[PDB]
Amino acid sequence: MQDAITAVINNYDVQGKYLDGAALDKLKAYFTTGAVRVRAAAVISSNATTIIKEAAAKALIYSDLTRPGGNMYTTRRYAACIRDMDYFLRYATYAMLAGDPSILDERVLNGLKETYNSLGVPIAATVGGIQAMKEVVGGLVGPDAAKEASIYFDYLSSGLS
Amino acid sequence: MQDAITAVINNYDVQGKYLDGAALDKLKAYFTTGAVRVRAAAVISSNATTIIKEAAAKALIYSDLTRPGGNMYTTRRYAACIRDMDYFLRYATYAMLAGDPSILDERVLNGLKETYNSLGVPIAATVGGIQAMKEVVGGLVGPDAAKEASIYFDYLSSGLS
Amino acid sequence: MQDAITAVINNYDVQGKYLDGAALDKLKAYFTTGAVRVRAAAVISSNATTIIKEAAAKALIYSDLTRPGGNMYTTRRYAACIRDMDYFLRYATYAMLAGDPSILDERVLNGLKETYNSLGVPIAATVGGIQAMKEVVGGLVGPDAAKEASIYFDYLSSGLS
Amino acid sequence: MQDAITAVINNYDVQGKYLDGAALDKLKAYFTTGAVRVRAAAVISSNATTIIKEAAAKALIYSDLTRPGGNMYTTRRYAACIRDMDYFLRYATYAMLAGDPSILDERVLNGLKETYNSLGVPIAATVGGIQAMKEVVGGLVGPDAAKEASIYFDYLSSGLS
Amino acid sequence: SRYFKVTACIPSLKRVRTGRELQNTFFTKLVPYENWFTEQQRIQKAGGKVLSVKLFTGVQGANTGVGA
Amino acid sequence: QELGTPINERSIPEMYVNQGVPALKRQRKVFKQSQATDRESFDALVTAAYVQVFDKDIASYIRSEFSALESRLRNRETSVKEFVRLLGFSALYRKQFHDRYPNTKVVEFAFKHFLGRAVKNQAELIKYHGLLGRKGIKALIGALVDGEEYGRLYGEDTVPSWQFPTLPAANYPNSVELYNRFTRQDDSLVVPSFKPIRSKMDIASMPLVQAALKEQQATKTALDMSRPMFLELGRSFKGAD
Amino acid sequence: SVLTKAIVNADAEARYLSPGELDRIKSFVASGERRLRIAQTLTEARERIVKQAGDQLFQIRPDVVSPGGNAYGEKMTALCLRDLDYYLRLVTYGIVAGDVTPIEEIGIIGVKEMYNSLQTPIPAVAEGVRAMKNVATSLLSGDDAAEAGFYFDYLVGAMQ
Amino acid sequence: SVLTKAIVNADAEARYLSPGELDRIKSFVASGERRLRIAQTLTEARERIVKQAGDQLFQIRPDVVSPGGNAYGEKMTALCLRDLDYYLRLVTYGIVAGDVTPIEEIGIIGVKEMYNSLQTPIPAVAEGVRAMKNVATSLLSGDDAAEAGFYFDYLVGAMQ
Amino acid sequence: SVLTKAIVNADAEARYLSPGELDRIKSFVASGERRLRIAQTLTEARERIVKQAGDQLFQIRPDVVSPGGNAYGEKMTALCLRDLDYYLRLVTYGIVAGDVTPIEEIGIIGVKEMYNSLQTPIPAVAEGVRAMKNVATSLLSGDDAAEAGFYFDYLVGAMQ
Amino acid sequence: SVLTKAIVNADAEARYLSPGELDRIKSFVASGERRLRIAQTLTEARERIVKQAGDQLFQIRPDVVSPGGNAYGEKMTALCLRDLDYYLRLVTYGIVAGDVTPIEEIGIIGVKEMYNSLQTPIPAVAEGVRAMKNVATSLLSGDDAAEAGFYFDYLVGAMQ
Numbered sequence A, B, C, D: 001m002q003d004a005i006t007a008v009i010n011n012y013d014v015q016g017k018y019l020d021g022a023a024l025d026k027l028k029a030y031f032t033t034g035a036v037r038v039r040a041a042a043v044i045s046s047n048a049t050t051i052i053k054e055a056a057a058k059a060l061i062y063s064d065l066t067r068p069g070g071n072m073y074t075t076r077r078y079a080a081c082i083r084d085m086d087y088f089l090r091y092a093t094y095a096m097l098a099g100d101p102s103i104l105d106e107r108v109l110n111g112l113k114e115t116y117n118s119l120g121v122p123i124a125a126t127v128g129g130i131q132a133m134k135e136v137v138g139g140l141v142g143p144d145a146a147k148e149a150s151i152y153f154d155y156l157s158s159g160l161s
Numbered sequence E: 001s002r003y004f005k006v007t008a009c010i011p012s013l014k015r016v017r018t019g020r021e022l023q024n025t026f027f028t029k030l031v032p033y034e035n036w037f038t039e040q041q042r043i044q045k046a047g048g049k050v051l052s053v054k055l056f057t058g059v060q061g062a063n064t065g066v067g068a
Numbered sequence F: 001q002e003l004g005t006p007i008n009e010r011s012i013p014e015m016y017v018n019q020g021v022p023a024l025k026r027q028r029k030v031f032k033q034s035q036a037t038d039r040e041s042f043d044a045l046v047t048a049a050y051v052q053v054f055d056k057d058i059a060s061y062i063r064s065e066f067s068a069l070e071s072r073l074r075n076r077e078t079s080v081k082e083f084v085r086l087l088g089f090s091a092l093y094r095k096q097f098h099d100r101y102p103n104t105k106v107v108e109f110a111f112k113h114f115l116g117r118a119v120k121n122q123a124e125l126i127k128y129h130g131l132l133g134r135k136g137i138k139a140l141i142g143a144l145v146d147g148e149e150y151g152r153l154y155g156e157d158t159v160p161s162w163q164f165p166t167l168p169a170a171n172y173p174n175s176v177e178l179y180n181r182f183t184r185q186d187d188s189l190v191v192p193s194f195k196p197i198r199s200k201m202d203i204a205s206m207p208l209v210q211a212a213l214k215e216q217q218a219t220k221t222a223l224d225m226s227r228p229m230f231l232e233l234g235r236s237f238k239g240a241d
Numbered sequence G, H, I, J: 001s002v003l004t005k006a007i008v009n010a011d012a013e014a015r016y017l018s019p020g021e022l023d024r025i026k027s028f029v030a031s032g033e034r035r036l037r038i039a040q041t042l043t044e045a046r047e048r049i050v051k052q053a054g055d056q057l058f059q060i061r062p063d064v065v066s067p068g069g070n071a072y073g074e075k076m077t078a079l080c081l082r083d084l085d086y087y088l089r090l091v092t093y094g095i096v097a098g099d100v101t102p103i104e105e106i107g108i109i110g111v112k113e114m115y116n117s118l119q120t121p122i123p124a125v126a127e128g129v130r131a132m133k134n135v136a137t138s139l140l141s142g143d144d145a146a147e148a149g150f151y152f153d154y155l156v157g158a159m160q
């Protein structure tokens, strides 16, 4: 994986360049937002379970999805689905700390679209589950962090569609 | 394409068999339901536009799908979507007359899943549009024809998922 | 896999239906033939080797198949072929006990047609090997069980062609 | 294994005692030496190969040990011996970081005396190889860390004799 | 070519377990010379005592034939 | 009543029966040595360890070559892990799953016979495939079986098994592809290598960083400081223009 | 079923069924009509069993139908009894299958995670499931009531 | 500790500690005196924390100290608070270790099986554990109260 | 970085980062400004560090610039200093990130095999790096010189 | 505000602001953005905060929502949460003002007389406010949670 900082280092390493003014400006733009990323992660982590619960309640359950014939019918599949939800939330929190989406590609999106096609897992319904968790997250983390958390949920959801 | 009758003829032709008792029984099972298929097609055809309107109203519009960022946003895409809906309805009516789903594969499903993935067209939302038209159709055509119309809508929808 | 008792349950579960009268009638139709299935399996199992021997003798060996240039030439390939034969016999015996062909799809037919195309294994010749074992089986198991054993051999053989 | 922080906890747990003043004083006595342990480990790790080379040169090679009839004769056994040396160095570095010798018992000394008796490996010669690496280590790590590194080499060597 | 015969006792420290499991915790067995060693580590890195080790197959002196 | 009935009829009940992992994940059995005491049972264990390593088709032909190995297992001289390892070092293994394939499919086949899955990431292919290039098959096998992963998952007795893994990304579908190919059905490498990903969002275009860079500009150019005003009053903001 | 569980053992050892395995299929299938009757009786009284289970449950623990209760209100209650209807259905399936395979995949594996999310109080649910045993069992002969009772106590067991 | 958890990774890969691993040991040990102060304060008020936790618990759920309650009576109560004293002790251990290794082996692995046997109601116990957080946290500075709070919420988490 | 290392360990365990796994990162952020500054300082004097490193090297090991030496000649020496310029660059990268990470992938994993092929004496490359430490360290304050020195000694360590 | 309070004391003693008064205006205004963030977060979660205070309240006092209780019934409960929504709003006002002037004139002076007339139990309104503190405080960083907490405890104090 890479973060903001290693994204820059590797982009310069392939050119064998010492870090110059443009590079140093990028890294500053990361460091200057760093404390806010940490606070936001502590809110998400400590509200993890409630975010999933409120996101499922707005976007998944009370529906045909949970009623025989639906993909989250059976305790078995309901558990798998909210398990997935926890992955998304947790990794988006990593991406936002790192300030780089590369981890969402390497460890979450790669092959996932076809995995879901192969099992029958409804893609559009999963995206709504992602964009509902974003909605909840953006309330909990506040002005400071709302836009920055949000983008990696949006990265996740256009990665499936 | 093939219908009930040519399905049987081609299955025997590859064995070079004259039609035997088992074959003749199958063909009877088609002919004996034939008049009912015709009446059902005349109801669907003549209510085509109302079925689409009621199916869209229950399963597509008044939603994020029709509001900026949604795939059926723009008059341009709204028109394409209900155009599609008309295809489904019309072809399902062909399949049900023929008593064979082969036309739904040859002229509708082949490549369509990936076509929709490539344009971004939401699959799950399209299935609901299919299963809503089925619901309306099953009311309009009555006891005689309800089960027989229904199956080719179900063929269409498990063809996408 | 599924069996007649299990299939009735999963077919109703997806509709969320209690078992009702129609379901209960199906299950009876299985239980009422159960003792006969068991006796038939004990005949097949205990005559396994003789059935393969008589089936090969009527439908495979004494031929170009066993001669140089033939697919069951070499002790290696002759062994592989009658090994296969044992699979078919054994699984058909499972399908007939279960009163459901689903195991023949899941664990025998899936990909087998193309596997045989890729190795050069003659399909038509293999079908004759299946329909010869059926012929022998139907003699050994008697009136009680003949039709019921036979169908899963016929399932196997139309699965390849 | 256990370390100074962990040992204090398990030593009190078996008595069911809260950590009290005496316990808290012990833990302080560890924390207050902690930074120095880390620096010392980084010197040992990064000079690993040179320490073995200088220790072997002072205490093992240029001798009957490396000549025919000697236990470190053959490239096989010479390799096994300096492989061992690396274990000792590496584990002593663990013990010194942990501030507890328990790992040297659990993962190094247990059964080793008899293992060496069974293979014929000369014990006294191995101790000199340990006490030569200590000598080198004590120069490289400096006043700060010399005594603390030294004791776990001495633990190792009285564990064999 | 050489083989060590070793006794190991490894307890379960996460989870308890529920069905017979007695050969999975205290066992003895011949192990090859090439591993016996990196399996000596896996056993001690999973918190297990190693009780006894015996040579079994080879000769203590060595030099030739060992390598096979 | 009706809040437990479907809403859209499941009208070809069957298409809805089969969605999910599939049935094979849970309709298969695990053989362990420790509850495979007694002769009847022990033969099953053994026969199922030839179906895990070797894979089914070619395990049908085994007759009695490994019979000295079986005696030792039967007599408790070696554990199930030793038996498994030793059957990977045998010439039959080597002939069947190594001699006819390129060295990167040898690693993949071995992953699925001794571990259950497919290669997880690329830092692995590299590790294990560069130990086969360096030392041949017996080191590749010896490594898989003595890993932490094998030990956690399988322990001393437990014949290895197919696990349908859930995590890392793509491990599940990669593995399920491997699992459902009969011997010689398809011999392509499934996981040839993991393509390296790229990056589509420059990191200074993100919101938090992007706005902390605008602020960075303002301060240096525009303004003065903590040194005496006389020094700050004769400063040029630009430097070369 | 007994078949699914057992054949699986056959295929996994690459062999035909044992005399033992064949015997149990025979004894099992002989006990078919009775098991079908047990399911019929209970299917026939499902609405009564659920409703009377629901009263027995809320006496033994009402708080769930109170201001801060998971099942507080008319439609939060319409769901709790619906879940009780679900589990009775699965119990009829189990009885006709002669084991839990179906009961398990449909309604216990994942049930902890589902209910923890909903913060339905699961342990109250076990008591609710237990009440259904009491009602259903009063509509069956002694012998059939015991045979049914094993499957009720299994579900009670799995929610644990 | 952090050491135990991390070194284990070193030995398992047959290697010396990484720069990363060395850095975290350094940052960890720098945070030592503070962690020791947090444990001292709580050790110093243990009897108050337990007692006030015990009142907070029985209001939020009294039934346990009633005729058919697991903790009914003077010596059935002397044991429930003693268990609360046990867990506060383990929480002080965890805080000074910087992880749960010790807390876990001593008092969560096996805890379901222990309490199920005793039929102590475990879920009431989680609430009791939660009460101690409230008391202990009111005797610590904001920063130290949070650091302590993570370990309380862990135990609450593990009884689940 | 410190970030990458922390996260990778987190994700492997599939649980959010700990509340203390948010202490090393905080230290690194404060450190990073200083770390960025040290790298810039090193970058400014690169040509002087390399050249003076190269003199210090050839005095201490004249054999590499001799008839049968890997660096014998004007253009076998030019490539040798270029390699010294490469490693100083990687050292600035390592310092700034706060974790060695990228340098390993760029210039130590595979370095034995590369130089063995070219027949370059590895331990005299390690000497060239010590020589650079000596020069670079004389252009930095005591505190910054130590912080830099760890990364020089790492490279020296990895070529071993 | 802090401004209003400082000035009123200034004008009443016929004088310019003190160094002290000037200092607090300066410290206050420096916390402006932070205080605005604290109000935003809580405004953003208002509906959730009232639904968790309301659950916490009805567990602790099921009687208020009982035959002879002031909040007994669906619309006597609806008004009760609306009052909880009122007080959360006033708490956001107080936090951005840095004192209670606004909170006080709007919702505590006269509150005894209002609720005595309606026969609302005042101390259980104080409990509803503690319940909101608990929820709101779990959506804020340690430092911001304390700053918010002072204003919650004030309202709890004034209903007394």
Ligand SMILES: CCC1=C(C)/C(=C/C2=NC(=C\c3[nH]c(/C=C4\NC(=O)[C@H](C)[C@H]4CC)c(C)c3CCC(=O)O)/C(CCC(=O)O)=C2C)NC1=O
Residues within 6 Å of the ligand: A061, A062, A063, A066, A067, A072, A073, A074, A075, G064, G070, G071, G072, G076, G077, G079, G080, G081, G083, G084, G086, G087, G106, G107, G118, G120, G121, G122, G123, G124, G125, G128
């Ligand atoms: C067949 C396998 C299966 C089961 C069992 C199942 C249960 C299930 N119970 C639900 C809700 C619920 N279930 C209950 C049940 C209870 N409340 C209590 O306090 C009692 C302990 C218990 C009644 C005995 C309640 C109160 C809700 C509503 C919770 C909410 O909406 O937050 C929901 C979400 C609503 C929905 O979309 O249907 C599901 C999916 N789903 C399944 O696929």
Ligand SMILES: CCC1=C(C)/C(=C/C2=NC(=C\c3[nH]c(/C=C4\NC(=O)[C@H](C)[C@H]4CC)c(C)c3CCC(=O)O)/C(CCC(=O)O)=C2C)NC1=O
Residues within 6 Å of the ligand: B061, B062, B063, B066, B067, B072, B073, B074, B075
């Ligand atoms: C930006 C391009 C764009 C447009 C214009 C657009 C229009 C639009 N108008 C709608 C409904 C409607 N639009 C109207 C409009 C009118 N009724 C009248 O009699 C008048 C002639 C007219 C007002 C001047 C009405 C009454 C409905 C409700 C119809 C229904 O619900 O059946 C709907 C369905 C409701 C929804 O889901 O939003 C859409 C999508 N969508 C788009 O993406």
Ligand SMILES: CCC1=C(C)/C(=C/C2=NC(=C\c3[nH]c(/C=C4\NC(=O)[C@H](C)[C@H]4CC)c(C)c3CCC(=O)O)/C(CCC(=O)O)=C2C)NC1=O
Residues within 6 Å of the ligand: C061, C062, C063, C066, C067, C072, C073, C074, C075, C078
């Ligand atoms: C090159 C590798 C290879 C071999 C060896 C081979 C042997 C072979 N021997 C056969 C039959 C036979 N083989 C024998 C041989 C014997 N009878 C005896 O009693 C003696 C012991 C023995 C002569 C020494 C007999 C009698 C049959 C006829 C058996 C029958 O038709 O049932 C058949 C079946 C007839 C056919 O289709 O050709 C094969 C394939 N096939 C091969 O691909």
Ligand SMILES: CCC1=C(C)/C(=C/C2=NC(=C\c3[nH]c(/C=C4\NC(=O)[C@H](C)[C@H]4CC)c(C)c3CCC(=O)O)/C(CCC(=O)O)=C2C)NC1=O
Residues within 6 Å of the ligand: C060, C065, C070, C071, C072, C077, C078, C080, C081, C082, C084, C085, C087, C088, C107, C108, C115, C119, C121, C122, C123, C125, C126, C129, F056, F057, F058, F182, F183, F184
């Ligand atoms: C458990 C279900 C299952 C089945 C059924 C199965 C079939 C199967 N048959 C195979 C080959 C084969 N199959 C045959 C079969 C025949 N040769 C003939 O000429 C006849 C027409 C026919 C026998 C009647 C032969 C000769 C081969 C060897 C092809 C080769 O030389 O590679 C192979 C390739 C691997 C191997 O050689 O073992 C598979 C997997 N595998 C399975 O896992």
Ligand SMILES: CCC1=C(C)/C(=C/C2=NC(=C\c3[nH]c(/C=C4\NC(=O)[C@H](C)[C@H]4CC)c(C)c3CCC(=O)O)/C(CCC(=O)O)=C2C)NC1=O
Residues within 6 Å of the ligand: D061, D062, D063, D066, D067, D072, D073, D074, D075, D078
């Ligand atoms: C039979 C298997 C076997 C071999 C080969 C072996 C070699 C061996 N060579 C040694 C030293 C040495 N070997 C050499 C050899 C050379 N110097 C060069 O530059 C040339 C490339 C090369 C001569 C062709 C030198 C110079 C030393 C002394 C190194 C020292 O003392 O640091 C030593 C350490 C001195 C001793 O204790 O004997 C051993 C053990 N030992 C064995 O058991």
Ligand SMILES: CCC1=C(C)/C(=C/C2=NC(=C\c3[nH]c(/C=C4\NC(=O)[C@H](C)[C@H]4CC)c(C)c3CCC(=O)O)/C(CCC(=O)O)=C2C)NC1=O
Residues within 6 Å of the ligand: D060, D065, D070, D071, D072, D077, D078, D080, D081, D082, D084, D085, D087, D088, D107, D108, D115, D119, D121, D122, D123, D125, D126, D129, E037, E040, E041, E061, E062
């Ligand atoms: C992780 C902790 C650990 C340790 C320490 C360890 C030691 C150890 N040393 C061994 C052999 C040996 N050890 C030596 C050591 C020496 N030869 C000498 O002459 C010197 C006195 C001495 C080096 C200073 C030699 C020569 C052998 C090979 C004996 C043989 O030929 O079989 C063996 C037998 C297996 C093997 O050959 O690798 C073990 C297990 N194993 C472990 O798992």
Ligand SMILES: CCC1=C(C)/C(=C/C2=NC(=C\c3[nH]c(/C=C4\NC(=O)[C@H](C)[C@H]4CC)c(C)c3CCC(=O)O)/C(CCC(=O)O)=C2C)NC1=O
Residues within 6 Å of the ligand: E011, E012, E016, E017, E019, E020, E021, E022, E023, E025
């Ligand atoms: C299927 C037949 C079978 C049996 C009976 C069996 C017993 C058995 N008990 C064990 C440990 C143990 N057994 C006990 C038992 C007790 N502690 C006490 O104080 C009491 C006196 C007693 C209970 C009445 C304890 C406490 C341990 C854990 C020892 C440790 O911490 O390592 C272990 C070590 C592995 C493990 O921890 O699970 C085994 C194998 N294993 C088997 O396979």
Ligand SMILES: CCC1=C(C)/C(=C/C2=NC(=C\c3[nH]c(/C=C4\NC(=O)[C@H](C)[C@H]4CC)c(C)c3CCC(=O)O)/C(CCC(=O)O)=C2C)NC1=O
Residues within 6 Å of the ligand: A060, A065, A070, A071, A072, A077, A078, A080, A081, A082, A084, A085, A087, A088, A107, A108, A115, A119, A121, A122, A123, A125, A126, A129, F019, F020, F021, F022, F164, F165, F166, F167, F168, F169, F170, F172
């Ligand atoms: C670490 C990164 C990672 C991810 C994200 C991941 C996803 C993932 N989801 C899976 C299944 C699944 N995923 C879902 C998800 C859902 N069901 C719905 O209806 C909703 C639309 C949705 C939840 C919002 C379900 C129901 C299954 C089970 C399918 C089955 O029954 O086989 C599986 C198959 C293996 C398993 O069942 O665990 C994987 C690997 N695996 C990974 O390693």
Ligand SMILES: CCC1=C(C)/C(=C/C2=NC(=C\c3[nH]c(/C=C4\NC(=O)[C@H](C)[C@H]4CC)c(C)c3CCC(=O)O)/C(CCC(=O)O)=C2C)NC1=O
Residues within 6 Å of the ligand: F068, F070, F071, F072, F074, F075
């Ligand atoms: C490769 C070298 C090697 C040898 C030699 C070997 C011998 C050996 N003989 C065994 C058993 C046995 N060995 C015999 C032998 C005999 N019975 C008699 O009455 C006669 C006196 C004698 C034959 C002349 C018998 C009957 C058993 C079975 C004991 C039992 O029932 O467990 C076993 C126990 C495991 C098993 O049953 O296979 C081993 C390991 N194992 C080896 O790995």
Ligand SMILES: CCC1=C(C)/C(=C/C2=NC(=C\c3[nH]c(/C=C4\NC(=O)[C@H](C)[C@H]4CC)c(C)c3CCC(=O)O)/C(CCC(=O)O)=C2C)NC1=O
Residues within 6 Å of the ligand: F102, F103, F104, F125, F126, F129, F130, F193
């Ligand atoms: C036994 C038969 C066999 C071959 C031949 C083989 C090749 C092979 N080359 C690989 C990578 C590679 N191959 C190269 C080769 C080159 N780079 C260049 O620029 C040059 C043009 C070229 C050398 C002349 C490189 C640089 C990589 C690494 C790609 C990466 O970073 O992932 C890999 C990926 C796994 C790994 O990294 O080891 C394989 C499997 N594998 C095999 O099993």
